[PDB]
């Protein structure tokens, strides 16, 4: 990465979990 | 002092580009855990270099 | 009340799983 | 690309999306990034041209 040093941001982790999605009428995930 | 915080229920994306209506569909893929900890990055000046690994939210 | 309770109707008719209508209609 | 017909049982192939059936008009508002459609039984139901 590159930074302009003479700033707050967050970073998570992804891995192969599983979800139970909930689609809506307009194809929108509500949960 | 790593200021970990509760990731809440964020990080959910559309797994696929197909429209679905009123369906509770299951899927397993590279995902962000719920109610987990996300590592905040400070603002000083320490210039860490991070691997990508399987996936990064 | 029964009909409004119980609720799929045609989602399982698109693959050849034809549903013969009852000889006796609902009415 | 071939011509477009409706209300006629036709073999159709939309960018690899195969299937044979009759194509009608529907009002199911797709999202701009949403391309195809399914149902509870994972049956191709609504398709964007
Ligand atoms: C879908 O979008 C329309 C706007 O065209 C809106 O009126 C409708 O409420 C939306 N559907 C839902 C379930 O919110
Ligand atoms: C997550 O961060 C909190 C600080 O808000 C801490 O109390 C907890 O032990 C951390 N959990 C893990 C698994 O790192």
Phi then psi for residue D37, to 5 deg, are -140, 150
Which of these, B14, D46, B10, B29, lies nearest to A28 by C-alpha position?
A: B14
Return the residue whose CA atom lies nearest to atom 4 of ligand 2: B4
How far apart are alpha carbons B9 and B27 in whole angstroms? 17
Residues from chain D that touch C9, judged by Cβ atoms under 8 A, are none
* Strand pairing category for D36-37 and B18-19: parallel
Query: D7: Cβ–Cβ under 8 A, 6 or more apart, which residues?
Result: D22, D23, D24
Chain A residue with the nearest C-alpha to that of B44: A5
Neighbours of D34 (CB within 10 A): 20
Task: Tell me which method was used to determine the 3D structure.
Answer: cryo-EM
- Measure in Å the smallest separation between the Cα of D24 and chain C Cα atoms: 15
Number of Cβ within 10 Å of residue B38's Cβ equals: 19
């Amino acid at each position: 990465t590159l930074l302009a040093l003479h700033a707050a941001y967050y970073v998570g982790y992804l891995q192969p979990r599983t979800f139970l999605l909930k689609y809506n009428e307009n194809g929108t995930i509500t949960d | 002092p790593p200021a970990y915080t509760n990731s809440f229920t964020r990080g959910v994306y559309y797994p696929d580009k197909v429209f679905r209506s009123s369906v509770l569909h299951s899927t397993q893929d590279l995902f962000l855990p719920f109610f987990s900890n996300v590592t905040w990055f400070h603002a000083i000046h320490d210039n860490p270099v991070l691997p990508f690994n399987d996936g990064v939210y | 009340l029964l009909f409004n309770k119980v609720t799929l109707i045609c989602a399982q008719k698109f693959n050849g799983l034809t549903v013969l209508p009852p000889l006796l209609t609902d009415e | 690309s071939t011509n477009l017909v409706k209300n006629k049982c036709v073999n159709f192939n939309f960018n690899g999306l195969t299937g044979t059936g009759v194509l009608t008009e529907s009002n199911k508002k797709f999202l701009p990034f949403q391309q195809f459609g399914r149902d509870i039984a994972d049956t191709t139901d609504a398709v964007r041209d």
